[PDB]
Design a protein around this nucleic acid. Structure first.
Ligand SMILES: Nc1ncnc2c1ncn2[C@H]1C[C@H](O)[C@@H](COP(=O)(O)OP(=O)(O)OP(=O)(O)O)O1
Ligand SMILES: [Ca+2]
Ligand SMILES: [Ca+2]
Ligand SMILES: [Ca+2]
Length: 341
DNA sequence: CATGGAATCCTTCCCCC
DNA sequence: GGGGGAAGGATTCC
């Protein structure tokens, strides 16, 4: 079984670069301005000219300018990146019907057919990296291996602009050498709970009584880990589908004032509805980020679709329930529509 | 200082054979 | 006791 994982390099920055080659060579930072103040916002992503100096997704736009005051800073243009991504996803389809679009820049292909071994796999890897670099002019990294997890790990290793294969001989040394935290799906919270269990490697998951592990990180997660370690993880490449559509915005000022909030909320709803395009939700949730960056939410499922008129009205009772229930001031507000017909 | 989007799992009810 | 869902939160990663 051979899985090939494709991963567009510093994607947003690269796209901004492809749309204005004059940028190539310079440090480019794609930002998300929250407009609360001068350069308030976070970094969506940066190309390597910037990443090599610490500028990476998540850090404040202000902190980055301290590091590279002369780098190019650009506002995020989601739609544009999204279309470029789709086009690229097709070039990839033409390499296997078995494709799993994970994110806006990640995908897996089941090429157990086409290829007969890790060699022809590699070639197909160079062939693909090439077609994309030609058709759209964008570099991607290719991870190749037995299952999705290791194909992705190969990618993390071989990037940027690389391609790497992780054969069975190596998978086994990794299940031993590779640090557990460096395993897809293990954030810091998990990584932390894992230390406390003396589990710092995939292998240690076999020296613990499953039931204790299930009580620490959860059944799903514990089974996930245990099967990888046992060299038995074998998840299929399935095609995913949008299960929720939403929009969250930041308010110039933290508020509790219903009226002060509504405008931001209706705007979120409006945008959301435009995005739903043809899709009809039976579920709605109102989401809020408290002034201490905590998240609060209240929803409701209807026994039928939801009209914009109903959503408008219904989202207000939920924002009210929120303010009634919680007392902190609200920083960001938004809606999320799920359970399409 | 810290945008914003979305999927998945875990707990806690809760109604009911 | 446990099936079946809805809710609200926890956690991960793009
Ligand atoms: N906090 C964020 N806000 C908005 N967009 C984000 C955020 N974090 C990540 N993204 C986007 C950034 C990228 O354009 C896209 C993710 O690709 P990642 O960021 O996974 O790879 P990258 O392409 O920047 O790194 P690499 O050099 O491995 O290719 O997801
Ligand atoms: Ca990635
Ligand atoms: Ca990437
Ligand atoms: Ca990790």
């Amino acid at each position: 079984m051979i899985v090939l994982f494709v991963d567009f390099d510093y994607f947003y920055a690269q796209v901004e670069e492809v749309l204005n080659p004059s940028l190539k060579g310079k440090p480019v930072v794609v930002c998300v301005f929250s407009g609360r103040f001068e350069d308030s916002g976070a970094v969506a992503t940066a190309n390597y000219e910037a990443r090599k100096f610490g500028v990476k997704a998540g850090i404040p736009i202000v902190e980055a300018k301290k590091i590279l005051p002369n780098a190019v800073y650009l506002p995020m243009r989601k739609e544009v990146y999204q279309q470029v991504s789709s086009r690229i996803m097709n070039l990839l389809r033409e390499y296997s019907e078995k494709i799993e679009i994970a994110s806006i820049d990640e995908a897996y292909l089941d090429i157990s057919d086409k290829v007969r071994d890790y060699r022809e796999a590699y070639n197909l890897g160079l062939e693909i990296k090439n077609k994309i670099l030609e058709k759209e002019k964008i570099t991607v990294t290719v991870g190749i291996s037995k299952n999705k997890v290791f194909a992705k790990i190969a990618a993390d290793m071989a990037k940027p602009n690389g391609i790497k294969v992780i054969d069975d001989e190596e998978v086994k040394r990794l299940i031993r050498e590779l640090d557990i935290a460096d395993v897809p799906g293990i954030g810091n919270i998990t990584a932390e709970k894992l230390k406390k269990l003396g589990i710092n490697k995939l292998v240690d998951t076999l020296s613990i009584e499953f039931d204790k592990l299930k009580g620490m990180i959860g059944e799903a997660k514990a089974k996930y880990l245990i099967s990888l370690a046992r060299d038995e993880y074998n998840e299929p490449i399935r095609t995913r589908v949008r299960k929720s559509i939403g929009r969250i915005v930041t308010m110039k000022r933290n508020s509790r004032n219903l009226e002060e909030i509504k405008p931001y909320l209706f705007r979120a709803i409006e945008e959301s509805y435009y995005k739903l395009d043809k899709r009809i939700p039976k579920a709605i949730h109102v989401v809020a980020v408290t002034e201490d960056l905590d998240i609060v939410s209240r929803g409701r499922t209807f026994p039928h679709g939801i009209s914009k008129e109903t959503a408008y009205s219904e989202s207000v009772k939920l924002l009210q329930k929120i303010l009634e229930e919680d007392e902190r001031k609200i920083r960001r507000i938004g809606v999320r529509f799920s359970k399409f017909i």
